[PDB]
Structures are given as C-alpha cells and as structure tokens.
C-alpha cells in the first residue's frame, strides 16, 4: 500500500549533497525541490568516531538513506553520512 504521500519504499538509500546543520541532525540536498535531513543517530558510527562526520561539511557530497516523505510539502527524510571520496571539488559558477 502507499503511506499516504509515498514515492520511495523507505529504507531505499539516496547520495546528496550538504547544506545546513541543525539541532540534532543536518539537512542534505537531492535534486531541485527535493531536499532532505540526516537525523544525527542513523548510522552510530559518529561521536566514538573521533572524525568531524568524516569532515561533512557546508557543500560536501554523501549518502543518506531514506526516511519519512511528504510529496505535498516535498521532504524526505534521508539520512546516511558516510560521505564520498574526493567530497570537496571546486564550487564556482560564473564562467
């Protein structure tokens, strides 16, 4: 069946990109109009990790996995944070 507004099965893992932090979790963005938020304890490995998140930064690129979408206000929630190699690249657009 679909949880009312459901696209993905849940549990379903995405890549993305870092945006924001907060309280207890830090957002993550998709594509366009999609966007999402790791919530800080979907993984363990991260405290006892020694790591600053395996350095997850303002504009570094990750895995997350999926948790809870709204297609009406366009939230998923996903949250991985392991983080890609080679995450930092040169991020400058006017050329």
């Given amino acids: ?18 945006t924001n932090l907060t309280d207890y979790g830090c957002f993550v963005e998709i594509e366009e109009g999609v966007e999402g938020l790791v919530h800080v304890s979907e993984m363990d490995w991260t405290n006892k ?11 570094d690129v990750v895995e997350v996995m999926v948790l809870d979408i709204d297609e009406e206000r366009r939230r998923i929630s996903l949250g991985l944070k392991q983080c890609k190699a080679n995450p930092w690249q040169q991020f400058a657009e006017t050329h």
Wanted: no cysteine; proline share 7%.
């Fill in 1 to 18: 069946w679909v949880a009312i507004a459901k696209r993905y099965p849940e549990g379903t893992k995405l890549t993305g990109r870092v």
């Fill in 49 to 59: 990790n020694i790591h600053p998140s395996k350095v997850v930064n303002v504009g």
